[PDB]
Design a protein around this ligand. Sequence first.
Ligand code: HEM
Ligand code: ANN
Ligand code: CL
Ligand code: MG
Length: 393
Amino acid sequence: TIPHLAIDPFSLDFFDDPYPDQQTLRDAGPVVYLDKWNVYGVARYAEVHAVLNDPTTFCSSRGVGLSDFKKEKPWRPPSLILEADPPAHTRPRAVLSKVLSPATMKTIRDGFAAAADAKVDELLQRGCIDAIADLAEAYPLSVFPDAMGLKQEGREHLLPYAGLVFNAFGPPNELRQTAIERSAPHQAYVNEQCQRPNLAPGGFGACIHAFTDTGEITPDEAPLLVRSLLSAGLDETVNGIGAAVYCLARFPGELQRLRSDPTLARNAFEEAVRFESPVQTFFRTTTREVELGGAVIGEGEKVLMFLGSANRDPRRWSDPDLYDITRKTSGHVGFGSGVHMCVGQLVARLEGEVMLSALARKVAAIDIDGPVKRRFNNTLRGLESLPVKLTPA
Ligand code: HEM
Ligand SMILES: COc1ccc(C(=O)O)cc1
Ligand SMILES: [Cl-]
Ligand SMILES: [Mg+2]
């Protein structure tokens, strides 16, 4: 009843061009079985959405990577939020929600916007730049470590650690094993910065610690919760901004619409998140036997959700392969859905909005002018190098 496929969704060949294989995964059936890794897969929008919104059956506390925490040891102590189910999930989630709240966005918006404007003006003086290293990476590194309240020393470990986190959700292939091997210096840096004295008062990390006074988290929970914000947030946002720049270069009509109404910047970034889905995949583990789209899945089984495929499923989206900055993007699963839906989504949207606003107001054209290179990661989709020439408005 369940079709078995040999597609490896963690192979370099798949990362290089995943979209034909994603259609094969969708059209095979609502539920497939991937023989390469012995997991179930759901690639259509309806089942991916249903699984995300059924946390008592499709749980997160046994890991959201391939590894089942009931069978194997986690490579680092489990996240208190990502790798937890309700009710244990609830109070750490509430703390991060308040630390990254709408009210908090007011305190950082002016500096985040000012840094984006300044970066675009700096890049316009150079003309020919790498939109990853010099923009998609440089901009988040210029605002987010400061807003966390990190010291200057050691920040060279931040991008390597985020790459490791997302490679470690994958299967035990070369990308994962290379990342975890000799990763101790990255872990040691990150764990040290999670201690209260190393976090600047007023920043995100210090505010997490301040919530230990309230009873929502204990002081011994706060370092692991800070760790969540040094794990998530950097690489996915880098990849989303780089994909937006790529899209505005490949779809010049959409850059022109954005230039004509810069208030479309926020939705232009949301559409980039749907289009690219920087987080391609996550797993759940079944807590009981369950029927899903006619498929009977046993207990204790890993279920792979193709978020990127769900965001391109023609059963749900018109012209899913087009970048459309006025698309009604509500309902996309690029940030997840349900109790775990990205608690950092307002920070992500702020960074993406203000960068795309700066481009909309200052740049007349974005032309690819060098070899484009893909960045390979077991969980993240994104570019390594994007040489462009920026023409000033
Ligand atoms: C475009 C950028 C981003 C994308 C595509 C993204 C994607 C996601 C997705 C798909 C989830 C759901 C995980 C699941 O269901 O298991 C998630 C959760 C989460 N994200 Fe993001 N994220 C982004 C930016 C950020 C930022 C900027 C931060 C921090 C400031 C962040 C921190 C988190 C955390 C802590 C969670 C766990 C929430 C929970 O389990 O309740 N992410 N993210
Ligand atoms: C969605 O990606 C992540 C990765 C790590 C964490 C965490 O370490 O809590 C949360 C979300
Ligand atoms: Cl760590
Ligand atoms: Mg400082």
